């Protein structure tokens, strides 16, 4: 490939997947009379620790005051989890099998038989999104760009340093515009197919929070975590 310099820097921030994977597996084995949905909330929770860790030592994010950092992540935590999940399905996913953050492949058959209406609407919207990205040969350069466009959002209020946020939007957009031009020249549509996937990720993630809040009020989400604290505002 040919990777614009800014994308090379964003790539260096990607953590070692294999270590996150066994860290989350080992932790779940320790928590040990747990229910299926409760176990997955703990797996999503620890994935969110992993997301905050990545953001914390990322290029332009490390330069923000903590209050700016929180505002940005309170706005995009669920989008980052969805994007993370979606990109895991493009690379490692196969025929009828959700690839988990812990490394295993649960057959989609298992989820279909046990999932209610809300979760079916969510899992299915997620899968049509995965398949759209699968057909775009979505790669890691494009993925890390989308992550920074999601993180450095312009829909966030009360930012002390709105100038630096607007600047990384500007530069990441232009870096992605550059990468699609060099690597996929005769595929003019590519850039736009990636940007139009952002509204959809936002929507799946608002839906996911509403689902997770429904489950929390039903008493299914075991006592409080990073996920419910993000959910609380």
């Amino acid at each position: 490939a040919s990777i614009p310099h800014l994308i090379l820097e964003l790539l260096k921030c990607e953590p070692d997947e294999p270590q996150v994977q066994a860290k989350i597996m080992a932790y779940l084995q320790q928590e040990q009379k747990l229910s299926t949905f409760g176990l997955m909330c703990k797996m999503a929770d620890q994935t969110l620790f992993s997301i905050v860790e990545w953001a914390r030592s990322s290029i332009f994010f490390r330069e923000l005051k903590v209050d700016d950092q929180m505002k940005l992540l309170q706005n995009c935590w669920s989008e980052l989890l969805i994007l993370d999940h979606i990109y895991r399905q493009v690379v490692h996913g196969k025929e009828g099998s959700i690839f988990l953050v812990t490394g295993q492949q649960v057959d989609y058959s298992i989820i279909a038989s046990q999932a209610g209406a809300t979760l079916n609407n969510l899992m299915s919207h997620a899968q049509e999104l995965v398949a759209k990205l699968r057909s775009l040969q979505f790669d890691q350069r494009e993925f890390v760009c989308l992550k920074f466009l999601v993180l450095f959002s312009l829909d966030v209020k009360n930012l002390e340093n709105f100038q630096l946020v607007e600047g990384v939007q500007e530069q990441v957009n232009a870096a992605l515009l550059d990468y699609t031009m060099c690597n996929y020249p005769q595929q003019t549509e590519k850039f736009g197919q990636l940007l139009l996937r952002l509204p959809e990720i936002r929507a799946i993630s608002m839906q996911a929070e509403e689902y997770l809040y429904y489950k929390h009020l039903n008493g299914d989400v075991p006592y409080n975590n990073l996920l419910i604290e993000m959910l609380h505002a």
Partner: peptide, 10 residues
């Protein structure tokens, strides 16, 4: 219990 054991075994 059920799900976690399924994950380890394959």
């Amino acid at each position: 219990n059920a799900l976690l054991r399924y994950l380890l075994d394959k």
